[PDB]
Amino acid sequence: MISLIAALAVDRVIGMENAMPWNLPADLAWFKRNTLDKPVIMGRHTWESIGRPLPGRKNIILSSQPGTDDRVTWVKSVDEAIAACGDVPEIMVIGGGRVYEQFLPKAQKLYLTHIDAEVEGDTHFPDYEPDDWESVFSEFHDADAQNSHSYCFEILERR
């Protein structure tokens, strides 16, 4: 099955000028936890934003153009991206905006972090129909010395 994982600020903002402006180490730890040892699918802009392969994961990059780095797998379509994952229980789609839009209709699970921060951004998580999704896990955390905003981890399953 296909899952999406994302961190959303207020108004579903996920990025600004090809970057993620906040720093929330608790949330990056959650991301690592939930993606380690799974294939991760990302768009080319997100690959450039991360800037290097994610270790311990098969990194699959969607681009219409040929690949420029053989440390990762390059594919030209959604169907090719899925096929390159092989027969695994869970495929993690890690964005960005355009890639999330394409995989949302196929996804069975959403791993969402809601961050209490207002960021003037240019990229948004897709508008999802809330009736289609059941919350199966929710955990709220106040800000602390390491994490300057409060945040909520949620896992939603398609009903």
Residues 13, 121: contact at Cβ < 8 Å?
yes
Q: Which residues, numbered 52-81, are part of the site for ligand FOL (CB under 6 A)?
A: 54
Residue choice 2, 20, 72, 82 for contact with ligand FOL (CB under 6 A)? 20
Q: x-or-dash pattern for ligand FOL, window 119-158, by CB under 6 A?
A: ----------------------------------------
Element (DSSP H or E) covering residue 50: helix 44-50
| 25 vs 81: CA distance, rounded Å | 29
| 64 vs 105: CA distance, rounded Å | 21
Q: x-or-dash pattern for ligand NAP, window 62-101, by CB under 6 A?
A: xxxx----------xxx---------------xxxxxx--
Q: Which residues, numbered 9-68, are part of the site for ligand NAP (CB under 6 A)?
A: 14-15, 18-20, 42-46, 49, 62-65
Nearest to 18 by CA among 58, 56, 45, 52: 45
Contact status: 85 vs ligand FOL (CB under 6 A): no
The residues, any chain, with a CB within 8 Å of residue 37's CB and separated by 6 or more, are: 56, 57
- Rule CB under 6 A: which residues touch ligand FOL? 5-7, 20, 25, 27-32, 46, 50, 54, 94-95, 113
